[PDB]
Design a protein around this ligand. Structure first.
Ligand SMILES: NC(=O)c1ncn([C@@H]2O[C@H](COP(=O)(O)O)[C@@H](O)[C@H]2O)c1N/C=N\CC(=O)[C@H](O)[C@H](O)COP(=O)(O)O
Ligand SMILES: [Cl-]
Ligand SMILES: [Cl-]
Ligand code: NA
Ligand code: NA
Length: 257
């Protein structure tokens, strides 16, 4: 059954929803859909009350106050949330010890545009594959989906396809995949990507990006063959959108039957 995997994005110490492809910190501010002074713990507690497991908190960018904010969410819902944003071999265990169920990684395991297998094996040695989520967010490039790194500001040379997902599944508990081109834009999902994930992921996989109306959740079911879980950010009423969080929760609970 498809699960709603909720999110909390933290940028410069604040809960925000942004258009991720407009983050330009590797070298105009990002387009911001929503920002709040509300503690990330309040969102974590909301998700906990509704029984949503396996959501993710993202520490977007290098500001140290974003780390402090993310720990507020993990402490409010221990075991309930995955955490990502600049995770590496030096800090990955510390996030598990703050209450995260998993750490989410992309950039640390890429160098020279290639998968760095030694770094991947280092993370697996430290936290175990059961507590590692590999994020394979991607953009279509030359007819294939290319995994993008460095907060979606660099194309890797690794394609998201059947053989890559089969191989990387030996090192991760789940995959998280953002449709980078559609994310944050409230224009709908990338059904081609969802279908690829549902057909070829041997482990749980969560798609994120562009879910805007209830019918998009049904498109997730159909394109993904009920094999792909789904995150909603910008469109949710609690993040300034028009799609009611309460209606997405009820839809999630209806999948369990
Ligand atoms: N530029 C970015 O925005 C971004 N770049 C990397 N990540 C993730 O940072 C983590 C660590 O990667 P790394 O070891 O730091 O390289 C990985 O997961 C990267 O893929 C991002 N996700 C940020 N928020 C996610 C979010 O708000 C909702 O999930 C989603 O966008 C809502 O979509 P919606 O509004 O409904 O369209
Ligand atoms: Cl790289
Ligand atoms: Cl909306
Ligand atoms: Na890297
Ligand atoms: Na977003």
């Amino acid at each position: 059954s498809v699960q709603f995997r909720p999110c909390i994005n933290i940028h410069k110490g604040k809960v925000k929803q942004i258009v991720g492809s407009t983050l330009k910190d590797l070298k105009s501010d990002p387009i911001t859909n929503f920002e709040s002074d509300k503690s990330a713990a309040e969102y974590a507690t909301l998700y906990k009350q509704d029984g949503l497991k396996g959501g993710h908190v993202i520490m977007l960018g290098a500001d140290p106050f974003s780390k402090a904010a993310s720990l507020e969410a993990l402490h409010a819902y221990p075991g309930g949330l995955q955490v990502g944003g600049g995770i590496n071999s030096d800090n990955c265990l510390s996030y598990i010890e703050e209450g995260a169920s998993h750490v989410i990684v992309t950039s640390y395991v890429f160098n020279n545009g290639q998968m760095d297998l030694e770094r991947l094996k280092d993370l697996v040695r430290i936290v175990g594959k059961e507590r590692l989520v590999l994020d394979l967010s991607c953009r279509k490039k030359e007819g294939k989906y290319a995994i993008v790194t460095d907060r979606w500001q660099k194309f890797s040379d690794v394609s998201l396809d059947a053989k890559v997902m089969e191989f990387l599944a030996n090192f991760a508990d789940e995959f998280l995949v953002h449709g980078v081109d559609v994310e944050g834009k409230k224009l709908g999902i990338d059904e081609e990507l969802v279908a690829l994930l549902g057909k070829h992921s041997p482990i749980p996989v969560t798609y994120a990006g562009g879910v805007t109306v209830m019918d998009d959740l049904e498109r997730i079911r159909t394109a993904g063959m009920d094999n792909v879980d789904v995150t909603v950010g910008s469109a949710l009423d609690i993040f300034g959108g028009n799609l009611a969080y309460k209606d997405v929760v009820a839809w999630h609970n209806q999948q369990k039957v």
